[PDB]
Design a protein around this ligand. Structure first.
Ligand SMILES: *[C@](O)(C(=O)NCCCC)[C@H](C[C@@H]1CCNC1=O)NC(=O)[C@@H]1[C@@H]2[C@H](CN1C(=O)[C@@H](NC(=O)NC(C)(C)C)C(C)(C)C)C2(C)C
Ligand SMILES: *[C@](O)(C(=O)NCCCC)[C@H](C[C@@H]1CCNC1=O)NC(=O)[C@@H]1[C@@H]2[C@H](CN1C(=O)[C@@H](NC(=O)NC(C)(C)C)C(C)(C)C)C2(C)C
Lengths: 300, 300
């Protein structure tokens, strides 16, 4: 048993972490096939189409270890710079590009100068920020999910908001949330808490022995939601109750039942106890995260 | 900025995760060079020297993908079965074998049937248990640390204690703590909390903007320790104060000062606030973990 915040095996992604240098700006890139993907503010309220015609393929240093790659061409898809090189990546895995919805989770391989520093487990907060760990140097690092064999890149780093959270893009260049790669005032927007994720982790608690927080009480989907707002949680949909079923099936606790217990964790807190070793209601676990860890789905 | 519980990049370890099958017992193995390492209870109060003479090299199925390895010889170093095969591992990295002390942390690559499922960040609790995530199938999975380029294997899985924690060994076969690979009654022993680790993570809090928990107050090493026991924390040594210096240097808060603030977090709790997004005092971060993440040390 057990239950940890658990990242995907980073092997297939590490092989794709390369160094991109230009002027006095060095950030990370993602070399899949013969393309290297990196955040565009490496060519630096700038005008990036302005700045990309000024540069030539030879202005873009691309180290892949002690193996400098030659750029043969470049292009700017939204906020990503796509550097064609003269060399397919031998380590390119089966991969996808995907854009996640708020609530979903992914693993961040965190690089500096093209070298992997660490891997950890984020979700995409409701306000399209992520609570990350990114120092100066970390740009061009990717979030991702692994689907049997296929890596689904869903996030590139770019910038940090003034409160300590992090902003970024799908690998299609487009930013999650209103954020934009210029040094201007821009705010996250108030973060709610992901409700279907809090329930799931509670089913993870039940699958693991913490039952202290149950009760016979049922509630309606609505009367729960009248209490979810007051506590800054997503209103819960029936479509969430649907995904929560399998866990509800394996534990026998009706989703409406566990809602009524979450209701009670909200109105009385927790009185100095823990669920799964936390004194907070953890929303960074999706219902699938739970079923994967609490059932042992691997990746080949 | 930011601060997450962050695992090492698992790439070099994944390449070494193989499947070992024998009788009706299938667990994971660690193929470095021409040796495959796995927990010994794969040949199963058994007598393991008993059971290993009964078996032959041909009784040990070793898949490495769709690539069955031939065993050419075996041996039992404490609780590890060492299977010689007829094939060096091409993916064997620079590696070490090391035995960690309680308080130290490591990354667990978690496998089933030889396939990596997930990676997460443990420490070695004071009572030589680890708080892991291990289902049936997970045995032969390794903890580790990465030192520039060198992987330091420090833990193999074996068994789960009745309270939900996990027991295991250094890769030298020997179990951390009193535990033993037989199905007999055996208890963790009461877990204290790692104090030098709680301080470090607080310096991580300071390096990151949470200052709400300071105060002008200093304390002595002793008078702090009189309060550490009462709250089930390691007594703190001067030798810990020494390692905590660099963080104390970079923040300007004297180790004795931060002790006096931890004293105050213990006697009054926290009153519904958080440090680094936790409502608990997190002890799973060493002072080095902090300096690595809060400075950006990578691995090549
Ligand atoms: C990234 O580009 C990087 O890793 N730099 C290596 C290349 C050196 C030349 C950084 C990642 C940052 C650094 C630490 N934490 C992070 O998230 N990103 C940036 O440098 C980022 C790019 C400029 C300014 N950037 C910032 O991160 C800003 N954040 C903001 O400006 N925030 C606003 C938008 C004002 C709310 C700082 C001031 C460094 C936090 C761009 C294009 C925004
Ligand atoms: C490991 O061998 C495995 O992954 N099995 C795959 C091979 C199938 C034939 C497991 C890992 C366990 C399973 C779930 N969580 C874990 O930590 N280890 C064992 O099966 C372990 C080996 C027997 C019994 N084992 C247990 O884990 C016991 N734990 C105890 O017996 N605990 C005592 C020692 C009584 C306090 C169970 C009952 C399954 C929890 C050995 C040799 C202990």
């Amino acid at each position: 048993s057990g239950f940890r915040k658990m990242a995907f095996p980073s092997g297939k992604v590490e092989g794709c972490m390369v160094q991109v240098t230009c002027g006095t700006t060095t950030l990370n890139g993602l070399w899949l096939d013969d393309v290297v993907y990196c955040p565009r503010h490496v060519i630096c309220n700038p005008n990036y189409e302005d700045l990309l015609i000024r540069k030539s393929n030879h202005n873009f240093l691309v180290q892949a270890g002690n193996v400098q790659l030659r750029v043969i061409g470049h292009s700017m898809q939204n906020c990503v710079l796509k550097l064609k090189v003269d060399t397919a990546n031998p380590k390119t895995p089966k991969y996808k590009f995907v854009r996640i919805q708020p609530g979903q989770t992914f693993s961040v391989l965190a690089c500096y100068n093209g070298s992997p520093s660490g891997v950890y487990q984020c979700a995409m907060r409701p306000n399209f920020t992520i609570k990350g760990s990114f120092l100066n140097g970390s740009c061009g690092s990717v979030g991702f999910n692994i689907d049997y064999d296929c890596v689904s890149f869903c996030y590139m780093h770019h910038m940090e908001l003034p409160t300590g959270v992090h902003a970024g893009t799908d690998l299609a260049g487009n930013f999650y949330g209103p954020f934009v790669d210029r040094q201007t005032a821009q705010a996250a927007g108030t973060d709610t808490t992901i409700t279907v994720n809090v329930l799931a982790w509670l089913y993870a608690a039940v699958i693991n022995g913490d039952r202290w927080f149950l009760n016979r009480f049922t509630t309606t989907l609505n009367d729960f939601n009248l209490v979810a707002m007051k506590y800054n949680y997503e209103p819960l949909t029936q479509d969430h109750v649907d995904i929560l079923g399998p866990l509800s099936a394996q534990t026998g606790i009706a989703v409406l039942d566990m809602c009524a217990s979450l209701k009670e964790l909200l109105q009385n807190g927790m009185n100095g106890r823990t669920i799964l070793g936390s004194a907070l209601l953890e929303d960074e676990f999706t219902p699938f995260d739970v079923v994967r860890q609490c059932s042992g789905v691997t990746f080949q």
